Structures are given as C-alpha cells and as structure tokens.
Design a protein around this ligand. Structure first.
Ligand SMILES: Nc1nc2c(ncn2[C@H]2C[C@H](O)[C@@H](COP(=O)(O)O)O2)c(=O)[nH]1
Ligand SMILES: Nc1nc2c(ncn2[C@H]2C[C@H](O)[C@@H](COP(=O)(O)O)O2)c(=O)[nH]1
Length: 124
C-alpha cells in the first residue's frame, strides 16, 4: 500500500552515494527503482543527501509550486543531485537516460503527519 511519502523516497532518494559515479547511473537507477515499468518517466531527480536533511526542507522557504499549489518548499542550501532525463533515443519500453550531476536547490511539495516531501517539483 505505497504511501506518497514512501513513493517519494523510492523515486528520489539515494543517500548511499555522495553523487552519481558513472554515466550509467540513471539507466541503472531508473530501472531498479521501478520507474520505467508503465512508461519511460521523462525526467526524474535523485537527491544524494540524508533523509533527515531532505525532510527538513518542508520547514524551509515556502514558495509556489509550478502548478500554483502553495505547499512547496525550497531548500535554503544547495544539495547534491542527479538529473535523469530521457535521451533522443529513448522509446518505451526501451528507456534511455542521460545522467547529469549538479549542486542545486531543490523544491518539493510537502503533506502529511508527519509533514514530509511527496513530490519533487524542480531544482534551481
Ligand atoms: N515531476 C518531476 N518533475 C521534475 C523532476 N526533476 C525535474 N523536474 C521538472 C522541473 C522542470 O519543470 C522540468 C525540467 O525542465 P528543464 O530542466 O528546463 O528542461 O522537470 C522530478 O523528479 N519530477
Ligand atoms: N500529494 C501530491 N502528489 C503529487 C503532486 N504532484 C505529483 N504528485 C504525485 C503523482 C505521482 O504519484 C508522483 C510523481 O512523482 P514526482 O516525480 O515526485 O512528481 O507524485 C503533488 O503536488 N502532491
């Protein structure tokens, strides 16, 4: 019965590494986190920080979500992230991703008891 909180962690958290070490990281992780079974998800960001540090963003800078919701929050600090997005070649079910390492602020939507991230909105 996967909760939105848990779906966030499966799609976006990778606390086991400080950054993507190889150019194949997104192909391996998108598959292994189950993000290509229904379709190729076009864009997905992984965050290489502890869970507590990411959950804490829900008490940091309140901003508008891209869709106008008001329950989005931007990290005060940059975070280590991996941008995964489909390449030109990518075509379901043969998904293909480019791996880009970056240091950026994250913007997430939060909800719940506990009040935790449930959607990754953007990096800036
Ligand atoms: N839903 C969702 N959107 C993402 C995620 N990572 C980045 N984005 C969004 C932010 C931007 O709206 C868009 C990419 O835009 P750009 O970098 O300009 O091509 O993807 C993610 O993990 N989930
Ligand atoms: N609770 C909640 N879930 C959302 C929001 N936007 C997208 N989702 C859900 C739909 C999908 O199950 C999932 C997609 O993951 P993400 O890449 O984090 O947007 O997030 C939102 O604003 N609030």
């Amino acid at each position: 019965k996967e909760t939105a909180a848990a779906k966030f962690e499966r799609q976006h958290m990778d606390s086991s590494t400080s950054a993507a070490s190889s150019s194949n990281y997104c192909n391996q992780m998108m598959k292994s986190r189950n993000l290509t079974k229904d379709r190729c998800k076009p864009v997905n960001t992984f965050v290489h920080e502890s869970l507590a540090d990411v959950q804490a963003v829900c008490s940091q800078k309140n901003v508008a979500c891209k869709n106008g919701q008001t329950n989005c929050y931007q990290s005060y600090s940059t975070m280590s992230i991996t941008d995964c997005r489909e390449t030109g070649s990518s075509k379901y079910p043969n998904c293909a991703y480019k791996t880009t390492q970056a240091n950026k602020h994250i913007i997430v939507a939060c909800e719940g008891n506990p009040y935790v991230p449930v959607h990754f909105d953007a990096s800036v």
